From Swiss-Prot:
Residues of the full protein shown: 452 to 597 of 597
Function: RNA polymerase that catalyzes the synthesis of short RNA molecules used as primers for DNA polymerase during DNA replication.
Subunit structure, as described in the record: Monomer. Interacts with replicative helicase DnaB, as DnaB(6):DnaG(3). A stable complex DnaI(6):DnaB(6):DnaG(3) fragment can be isolated; DnaI and DnaG do not contact each other (DnaI in this complex is derived from B.subtilis).
Annotated domain remarks: Contains an N-terminal zinc-binding domain, a central core domain that contains the primase activity, and a C-terminal DnaB-binding domain.
Gene that this sequence comes from: dnaG
Highest taxon listed in the record's lineage: Bacteria
Species, as recorded: Geobacillus stearothermophilus
Protein name (Swiss-Prot/TrEMBL): DNA primase
Family: Belongs to the DnaG primase family.
Length: 146
C-alpha cells in the first residue's frame, strides 16, 4: 500500500457489523460508539440498517435486515453476522475495530496502537519496534492536526 494512506477502515466496519448484527443494543454501539460512514453502499447499508430498524422493530433482525441488501452485502452480511465475533462481541475486538472505524483526529485510536505497538516494544513486528514506533509518530500526526 505505497500509495494508500487511509481510504477507509472497511475492515473494522465489517466486523463492526458482525457485533451489531446481533442485538439492537449493539446497534446503538455501532451508531453511537462509531457512527461512521465510508464509500460503501452495502457496508453503509448495514450500519444504516440498524439505524432504521430501530424504528421498525427496535432490533436489527439478522434474517430480516441481512436479506435487505442488493447482492454483495447479502453473502457478506450473512457471514458477517458473526464471521469474526463472539456472543459477547469480544470486548478487545469491540474497541479494536470501532476505534479503527473512527479514522478521525482521535488520539484514542492511537491508544489502541499503544497496546499493539507496545507488544512490538517487547516482541516487535519484524526485527525492531521501530516499525510500530513509526506507527505512533504516524498516529500522533493523524490525531494531531499539522
Amino acid at each position: 500500500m505505497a500509495k494508500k494512506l487511509l481510504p477507509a477502515f472497511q475492515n473494522a466496519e465489517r466486523l463492526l457489523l458482525a457485533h451489531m448484527m446481533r442485538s439492537r443494543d449493539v446497534a446503538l454501539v455501532v451508531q453511537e460508539r462509531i457512527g461512521g460512514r465510508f464509500n460503501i453502499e452495502e457496508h453503509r447499508a448495514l450500519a444504516a440498517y440498524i439505524y432504521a430498524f430501530y424504528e421498525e422493530g427496535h432490533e436489527a433482525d439478522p434474517g430480516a435486515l441481512i436479506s435487505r441488501i442488493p447482492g454483495e452485502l447479502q453473502p457478506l452480511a450473512s457471514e458477517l453476522s458473526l464471521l469474526l465475533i463472539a456472543d459477547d462481541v469480544s470486548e478487545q475486538e469491540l474497541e479494536d475495530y470501532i476505534r479503527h472505524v473512527l479514522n478521525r483526529p482521535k488520539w484514542l485510536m492511537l491508544k489502541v496502537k499503544e497496546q499493539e505497538k507496545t507488544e512490538a516494544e517487547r516482541r516487535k513486528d519484524f526485527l525492531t519496534a521501530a516499525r510500530i514506533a513509526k506507527e505512533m509518530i504516524e498516529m500522533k500526526k493523524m490525531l494531531s492536526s499539522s
